[PDB]
Design an enzyme around this catalytic site. Structure first.
Site, mmCIF file in Angstrom:
data_model
loop_
_atom_site.group_PDB
_atom_site.id
_atom_site.type_symbol
_atom_site.label_atom_id
_atom_site.label_comp_id
_atom_site.label_asym_id
_atom_site.label_seq_id
_atom_site.Cartn_x
_atom_site.Cartn_y
_atom_site.Cartn_z
ATOM 1 N N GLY A 143 0.628 -1.215 -0.138
ATOM 2 C CA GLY A 143 0.051 0.091 -0.095
ATOM 3 C C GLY A 143 0.795 1.497 -0.058
ATOM 4 O O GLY A 143 0.736 2.250 -1.008
ATOM 5 N N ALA A 144 1.425 1.569 1.255
ATOM 6 C CA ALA A 144 2.411 2.759 1.183
ATOM 7 C C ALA A 144 3.471 2.202 2.415
ATOM 8 O O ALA A 144 3.356 1.616 3.121
ATOM 9 C CB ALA A 144 1.684 3.877 1.496
ATOM 10 N N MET A 145 4.617 3.037 2.150
ATOM 11 C CA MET A 145 5.578 2.854 3.223
ATOM 12 C C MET A 145 6.637 4.025 3.416
ATOM 13 O O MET A 145 6.957 4.501 2.535
ATOM 14 C CB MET A 145 6.569 1.321 2.929
ATOM 15 C CG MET A 145 7.858 1.150 3.900
ATOM 16 S SD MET A 145 6.921 0.960 5.531
ATOM 17 C CE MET A 145 8.406 1.791 6.596
ATOM 18 N N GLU A 146 6.644 4.601 4.521
ATOM 19 C CA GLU A 146 7.257 5.589 5.142
ATOM 20 C C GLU A 146 8.661 5.942 5.138
ATOM 21 O O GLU A 146 9.157 6.790 5.793
ATOM 22 C CB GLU A 146 6.712 5.940 6.362
ATOM 23 C CG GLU A 146 7.143 5.503 7.752
ATOM 24 C CD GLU A 146 6.465 4.125 7.961
ATOM 25 O OE1 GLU A 146 5.535 3.726 7.230
ATOM 26 O OE2 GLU A 146 6.569 3.692 9.074
ATOM 27 N N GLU A 156 1.831 9.211 5.154
ATOM 28 C CA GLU A 156 3.156 8.839 5.253
ATOM 29 C C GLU A 156 4.013 9.978 5.719
ATOM 30 O O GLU A 156 4.945 9.705 6.260
ATOM 31 C CB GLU A 156 3.481 8.260 3.917
ATOM 32 C CG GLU A 156 2.553 6.937 3.402
ATOM 33 C CD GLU A 156 2.615 6.047 4.362
ATOM 34 O OE1 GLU A 156 1.673 5.145 4.397
ATOM 35 O OE2 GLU A 156 3.622 5.565 5.252
ATOM 36 N N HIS A 207 4.739 10.569 9.383
ATOM 37 C CA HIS A 207 5.879 9.509 9.922
ATOM 38 C C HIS A 207 7.302 10.238 9.767
ATOM 39 O O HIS A 207 8.137 9.930 10.474
ATOM 40 C CB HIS A 207 5.848 8.295 9.182
ATOM 41 C CG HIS A 207 4.992 7.567 9.803
ATOM 42 N ND1 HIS A 207 4.719 6.991 10.797
ATOM 43 C CD2 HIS A 207 3.875 6.635 8.943
ATOM 44 C CE1 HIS A 207 3.793 5.903 10.972
ATOM 45 N NE2 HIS A 207 3.119 5.737 9.781
ATOM 46 N N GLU A 231 1.599 3.991 14.399
ATOM 47 C CA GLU A 231 0.578 3.676 13.302
ATOM 48 C C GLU A 231 -0.560 4.697 13.684
ATOM 49 O O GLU A 231 -1.327 4.922 12.995
ATOM 50 C CB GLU A 231 0.524 2.309 12.815
ATOM 51 C CG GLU A 231 1.572 1.914 12.048
ATOM 52 C CD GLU A 231 2.040 2.532 10.756
ATOM 53 O OE1 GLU A 231 2.947 2.294 10.086
ATOM 54 O OE2 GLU A 231 1.258 3.613 10.502
HETATM 55 ZN ZN LIG Z 1 1.957 4.615 8.777
#
Ligand SMILES: [Zn+2]
Ligand SMILES: *[C@@H]1O[C@H](CO)[C@@H](O[C@@H]2O[C@H](CO)[C@@H](O[C@@H]3O[C@H](CO)[C@@H](O)[C@H](O)[C@H]3NC(C)=O)[C@H](O)[C@H]2NC(C)=O)[C@H](O)[C@H]1NC(C)=O
Ligand SMILES: *[C@@H]1O[C@H](CO)[C@@H](O[C@@H]2O[C@H](CO)[C@@H](O[C@@H]3O[C@H](CO)[C@@H](O)[C@H](O)[C@H]3NC(C)=O)[C@H](O)[C@H]2NC(C)=O)[C@H](O)[C@H]1NC(C)=O
Ligand SMILES: *[C@@H]1O[C@H](CO)[C@@H](O[C@@H]2O[C@H](CO)[C@@H](O[C@@H]3O[C@H](CO)[C@@H](O)[C@H](O)[C@H]3NC(C)=O)[C@H](O)[C@H]2NC(C)=O)[C@H](O)[C@H]1NC(C)=O
Ligand SMILES: *[C@@H]1O[C@H](CO)[C@@H](O[C@@H]2O[C@H](CO)[C@@H](O)[C@H](O)[C@H]2NC(C)=O)[C@H](O)[C@H]1NC(C)=O
Ligand SMILES: *[C@@H]1O[C@H](CO)[C@@H](O[C@@H]2O[C@H](CO)[C@@H](O)[C@H](O)[C@H]2NC(C)=O)[C@H](O)[C@H]1NC(C)=O
Ligand SMILES: *[C@@H]1O[C@H](CO)[C@@H](O[C@@H]2O[C@H](CO)[C@@H](O)[C@H](O)[C@H]2NC(C)=O)[C@H](O)[C@H]1NC(C)=O
Ligand SMILES: *[C@@H]1O[C@H](CO)[C@@H](O[C@@H]2O[C@H](CO)[C@@H](O)[C@H](O)[C@H]2NC(C)=O)[C@H](O)[C@H]1NC(C)=O
Ligand SMILES: *[C@@H]1O[C@H](CO)[C@@H](O[C@@H]2O[C@H](CO)[C@@H](O)[C@H](O)[C@H]2NC(C)=O)[C@H](O)[C@H]1NC(C)=O
Ligand SMILES: *[C@@H]1O[C@H](CO)[C@@H](O[C@@H]2O[C@H](CO)[C@@H](O)[C@H](O)[C@H]2NC(C)=O)[C@H](O)[C@H]1NC(C)=O
Ligand SMILES: *[C@@H]1O[C@H](CO)[C@@H](O)[C@H](O)[C@H]1NC(C)=O
Ligand SMILES: *[C@@H]1O[C@H](CO)[C@@H](O)[C@H](O)[C@H]1NC(C)=O
Length: 902
Positions: free
Chosen positions: A285-288, A322, A325, A344
């Site tokens: 999905g997404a990663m920070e 994101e 973070h 999170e």
């Molecule tokens: Zn997150």
């Protein structure tokens, strides 16, 4: 004693200072079809306590280092012991360096290695992603370290508190672009041994965690902006996506978002640049990753011509999440995975604040309520739930770490933090948050550290007074699972709390240190007027005149549902609320108009109010123009549709909903100027979307007419689709439903030539709306043909057919009969038998259909059920529950609809 290399947690005897890492992906397979990457690394670490063993993480790496697997040196004039042997311990994912003597406290050492691994298409570590540009299959190299996969790319002390600086170099084909956390040092240079390759070195990272490293080699291009303060902002994507302008919205909102957070956190963005990259089929999905955030394409890219408003909302909120973070999580990092909820949860809350800055007319802050609060309460109101907190010593293995990433962590995390900010006030919350970020920058924390800094801010002022310490209060919300129903008797002002379970028969077996009593912040409105704030202490019952009413008055608790709880009243108060919403609804905040519906349906489920009381709470909706309350109703009733849409109950249900939604349909008909122009703000666009959906699916002739007109129009001129992207899914579906093979074949063609996933999704799903059995069956016949329907879309398409009341038996027969294809698809890509089973059996609600599920289970001898094995038991248990709920409710519900449908 146990050997430390057989323990999952690293020793604390050695701490890393800094790493050099050089990675080289080979994007051309080796002939057997194997892709590899090569690497070389040096880690400089300090000895804290004498030890004769170096234990570092390594996963699926082959070592080609000269001699042992590592070479070990002293830094400066430190002597080093000789290596005895190096060994790999697979279970605990360690490289183990046994020495002939001891490292010395205060001395620094450098450990060098050479290695290679598979550049696998497995979304883990340094991995490959394949995708199409025209006739060409393209392959890029990218990363996902989260949580314990940095060790899969190079040997490292792979725990989040063991932070260090990183000097990354990529060796890559010279026509490809290389990206990492930091900017490149300067221009790439040719690799001496083969000048078809280039070398790109990156500036040293700040002190940071391994799980936040990223590096990417691709053909991607970017759109750029230089913020006022010199921070370079780029959106990266496929060349064709960039050329179509699909990165522009992301670029538009990024600068404002970053600016919001720098102010919000009272802390400058800690990096020289911000890259964000859209990856096709990024399943995480997404990663920070710090300075290089990765997204799936549909999360980052936006096409104005084809994309709905909800698509726009997804982009701005995912970006805000994101980017949040880049301070909270990355600058200050939770020391261990058992505290993942804080990280999170925090981002899941402030994503709305940051997005609200970018789109200030959209009222985005409201969406946390439907999106996170009520969402997670569905699972947190079960006996099988769990506390936000987990003892650190229970979270050891990579599997246990992964289990941290769930609904409770994200959504309840967000919910309780939002509650906290609200009862402290935001200004106070921000002061403590700033204090915490400044104290712990480039270090690690536990949630107790945040509480302590929030307490400092509370203690430093006189205006906000709490019934206990920040910790003691939050302890109630973090150390025990679940949440209270707060019940008010407005005749006396008596107020009580009990642990709320949807299943009033359920046995809770998880014990609580607090006997499931909470300390509860309670706002309230009386006759449209805010009241003094109130705290329910840790008692079953109390009393306050704040909650006592006269006979013409009403009270309503939990304004805007800031508090993580649900509210019940005596029936008289319910009726006053109802009367109010019937006569001047605008006296009650829109969020609370929704709450009344959300809570009462949950209360009805729990047998705490009659179901007819919940339905009475929808009566006001015929004059409701706003999105949320209508969405509360639609969400709460979808189960009713699911249980009853094949029964005598259904006609009066449709008729009632038609009556309710007709005036809204009429309202938008006028407002939109005969549907030519959308409403302005997000919430109203959403309300329109739902009004048309609801009108059409319930058979409002006016909506039916609209869908036919537009779809006929489109069909007479295929290249100029007249249907606004917001309305496409309803208009397509209703129009295919109304029509035959002409509409069906036309939409099939469009599906086959669609370039954009989202439009393909809409088409695939509308095709399931046909009311012809023969078309649905033929369609079912396509779902396993990978030429006509992408495999990753097959079970989705079957579920959509199952959703069609007419396609229910067709889908069920189809799944039963072709079940004998687990052994084509537990092997060739996952398949999610689990979601398919849930989808096709969702409706089951009689003894007879239970007898069928059972009889179908008696295909146990072989093939089994794979990853859907557990799903099939859930199905049989859900069916029993449905059988019981329909017997209890069918009569009461049928008569209510008859009575209120005119
Ligand atoms: Zn997150
Ligand atoms: C981790 O990577 C760093 C970057 O490669 C290393 O630091 C660099 O070391 C280079 C040589 O080891 C130096 O480059 C030039 O090499 C010539 C060789 O003939 C030397 O005389 C020079 O000192 C040097 N350049 C100049 C202008 O003098 C670099 O100075 C140096 N780069 C830096 C410091 O930014 C680290 O050594 C490496 N770490 C470990 C532990 O090996
Ligand atoms: C890391 O080292 C592993 C162990 O040395 C390698 O795993 C081995 O891969 C070999 C294929 O490269 C397999 O051996 C044989 O390969 C030849 C030609 O490649 C084929 O004719 C044979 O079919 C194949 N033999 C068999 C029995 O299948 C081995 O299967 C495999 N060995 C083990 C112990 O897993 C990794 O490839 C290597 N990885 C990298 C990235 O360097
Ligand atoms: C990123 O931000 C950009 C700058 O704010 C936005 O650019 C705006 O695009 C709008 C949609 O194309 C334009 O609005 C109107 O377009 C119609 C169609 O032809 C014209 O008739 C109108 O004249 C025009 N707007 C006005 C105010 O007359 C805007 O022209 C344009 N705004 C600016 C300042 O350039 C992008 O839309 C935005 N990108 C995304 C994907 O949201
Ligand atoms: C990564 O690169 C940085 C920046 O060039 C190196 O930092 C230098 O460290 C040396 C030796 O410890 C010091 O003499 C210099 O003062 C440092 N420079 C700066 C600007 O901090 C760092 O050592 C490199 N990491 C490794 C493992 O070699
Ligand atoms: C980078 O160089 C490679 C090698 O010249 C190019 O890859 C070739 O692209 C053609 C299509 O133009 C394919 O038919 C070849 O099979 C490709 N070879 C390989 C190994 O992939 C590539 O197109 C270039 N990329 C850029 C962005 O310039
Ligand atoms: C962090 O917040 C502080 C407090 O608002 C900021 O410092 C204040 O800035 C205003 C703006 O003109 C001054 O008038 C105040 O006198 C300042 N207070 C103090 C104690 O210095 C500071 O600018 C913020 N820092 C960041 C990086 O955002
Ligand atoms: C985890 O974070 C703690 C702080 O929460 C780090 O401990 C601090 O280290 C700094 C800088 O070296 C000292 O100035 C502080 O006095 C320390 N605070 C303490 C010990 O409570 C700790 O170094 C981090 N852990 C690791 C392995 O880096
Ligand atoms: C509201 O709460 C009060 C108690 O705080 C209840 O009144 C008590 O009723 C019991 C009945 O056994 C008496 O023995 C107590 O002496 C009463 N306390 C009083 C009158 O102060 C009252 O029943 C509750 N009413 C509700 C929940 O409707
Ligand atoms: C309840 O939530 C509503 C939003 O749904 C809040 O209304 C906002 O009020 C602030 C301050 O006047 C304004 O910036 C926004 O324009 C308002 N939005 C709307 C749509 O009216 C309201 O403040 C909240 N109430 C409480 C007590 O917190
Ligand atoms: C819970 O325990 C009660 C005993 O009162 C029992 O009757 C019930 O069957 C048990 N399980 C459930 C799921 O209600
Ligand atoms: C309904 O209440 C709103 C807010 O209290 C008020 O401004 C409005 O005048 C009222 N409308 C009517 C028709 O009484």
């Amino acid at each position: 004693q146990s050997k430390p290399w057989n323990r999952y947690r690293l020793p604390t005897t050695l701490l890393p200072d800094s790493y050099n890492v050089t990675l080289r992906p080979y994007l051309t397979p080796n002939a057997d079809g194997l892709y590899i990457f090569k690497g070389k690394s040096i880690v400089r670490f300090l000895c804290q306590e004498p030890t004769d063993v170096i234990i570092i993480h390594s996963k699926k790496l082959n070592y080609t280092t000269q001699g042992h697997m590592v070479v070990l040196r002293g830094v400066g004039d430190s002597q080093v012991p000789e290596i005895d042997r190096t060994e790999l311990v697979e279970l605990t994912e360690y490289l183990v360096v046994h020495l002939k003597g001891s490292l010395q406290p205060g001395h620094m050492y450098e450990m060098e290695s050479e290695f290679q691994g598979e550049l696998a298409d497995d979304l883990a570590g340094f991995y490959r992603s394949e995708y199409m540009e025209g006739n060409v299959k393209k392959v890029l190299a990218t990363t996902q370290m989260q949580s314990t996969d940095a060790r899969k790319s190079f040997p490292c002390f792979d725990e989040p508190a063991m932070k260090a600086t990183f000097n990354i170099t990529l060796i890559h084909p010279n026509n490809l672009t290389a990206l990492s956390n930091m900017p490149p040092k300067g221009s790439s240079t040719p690799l001496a041994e083969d000048p078809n390759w280039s070398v790109t070195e990156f500036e040293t990272t700040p002190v940071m965690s391994t799980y936040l490293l990223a590096y990417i080699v691709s053909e991607f291009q970017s759109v750029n902006e230089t913020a006022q303060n010199g921070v370079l902002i780029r959106i990266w994507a496929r060349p064709n996506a960039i050329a179509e302008g699909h990165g522009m919205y992301a670029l538009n909102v990024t600068g404002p978002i970053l600016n919001f957070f720098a102010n919000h956190y009272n802390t400058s963005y800690p990096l020289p640049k911000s890259d964000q990259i859209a990856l096709p089929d990024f399943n995480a999905g997404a990663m920070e990753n710090w300075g290089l955030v990765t997204y799936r394409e549909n999360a980052l890219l936006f096409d104005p011509q084809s994309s709905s408003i909800s698509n726009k909302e997804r982009v701005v909120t995912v970006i805000a999440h994101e980017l949040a973070h880049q301070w909270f999580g990355n600058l200050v990092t939770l020391a261990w995975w058992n505290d993942l909820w804080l990280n999170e949860g925090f981002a899941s809350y402030v994503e709305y604040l940051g997005a609200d800055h970018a789109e200030p007319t959209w009222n985005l802050k409201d969406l946390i309520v439907p999106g996170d609060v009520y969402r997670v309460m569905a699972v947190d109101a079960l006996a099988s739930s769990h506390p936000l907190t987990t003892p650190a010593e229970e979270v050891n293995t990579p599997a246990q770490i992964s289990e941290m990433f769930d609904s409770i962590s994200y959504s309840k995390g967000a919910s309780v933090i939002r509650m906290l900010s609200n009862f402290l006030t935001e200004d106070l919350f921000k002061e403590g948050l700033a204090s915490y970020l400044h104290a712990f920058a480039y270090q690690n924390t536990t949630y107790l550290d945040l509480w302590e800094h929030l307490q400092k801010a509370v203690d430093a002022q006189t205006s906000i007074r709490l019934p206990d310490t920040v910790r003691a209060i939050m302890d109630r919300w973090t150390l025990q699972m679940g949440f209270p129903v707060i019940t008010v008797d407005t005749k006396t002002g008596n107020i009580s709390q009990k642990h709320f379970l949807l299943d009033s028969e359920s046995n809770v077996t998880r014990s609580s240190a607090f006997d499931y009593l909470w300390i509860v912040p309670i706002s309230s409105i009386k006759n449209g007027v805010m009241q003094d704030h109130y705290w329910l202490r840790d008692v079953s019952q109390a009393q306050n005149d704040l909650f006592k009413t006269a006979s013409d008055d009403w009270v309503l608790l939990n304004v805007n549902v800031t508090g993580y709880f649900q509210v019940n009243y005596d029936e008289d108060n319910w009726r006053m609320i109802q009367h109010q919403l019937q006569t001047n609804l605008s006296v009650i905040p829109v969020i609370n108009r929704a709450q009344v519906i959300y809570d009462s349906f949950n209360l009805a489920t729990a047998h705490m109010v009659p179901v007819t009381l919940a339905l009475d709470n929808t009566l006001f909706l015929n004059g409701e123009k706003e999105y949320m309350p209508w969405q509360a109703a639609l969400s709460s009733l979808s189960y009713f549709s699911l249980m009853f849409d094949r029964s005598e109950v259904y006609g009066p249900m449709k008729k009632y909903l038609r009556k309710q939604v007709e005036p809204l349909f009429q309202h938008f008909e006028t407002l939109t100027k005969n549907w030519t122009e959308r409403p302005e703000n997000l919430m109203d666009q959403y309300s329109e979307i739902n009004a048309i959906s609801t009108a059409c699916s319930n058979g409002l002739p006016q909506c039916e007419n609209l869908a036919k007109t537009l779809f006929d129009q489109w069909m007479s001129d295929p290249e100029n689709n007249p249907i606004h992207p917001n309305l496409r899914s309803t208009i397509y579906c209703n129009a295919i439903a109304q029509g035959g093979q002409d509409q069906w074949d036309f939409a099939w063609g469009q599906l086959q030539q669609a370039q954009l996933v989202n439009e393909a999704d809409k088409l695939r799903s509308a095709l399931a709306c046909s009311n012809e059995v023969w078309l649905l069956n033929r369609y079912l016949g396509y779902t396993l043909n990978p030429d006509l329907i992408r495999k990753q879309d097959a079970t989705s398409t079957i579920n959509s057919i199952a959703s069609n009341v007419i396609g229910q038996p067709l889908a069920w027969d189809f799944v039963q009969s072709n079940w004998k294809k687990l052994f084509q698809d537990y092997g060739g890509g996952s398949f999610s038998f689990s979601n398919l089973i849930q989808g096709v059996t969702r409706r089951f609600s009689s003894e007879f259909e239970l007898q069928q599920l059972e009889q179908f289970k008696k295909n146990n001898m072989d093939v089994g059920f794979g990853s859907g094995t557990r799903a099939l038991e859930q199905a049989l248990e859900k069916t029993k529950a449905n059988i019981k709920w329909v017997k209890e409710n069918k009569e009461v519900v049928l008569n209510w609809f008859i009575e209120h449908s005119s």
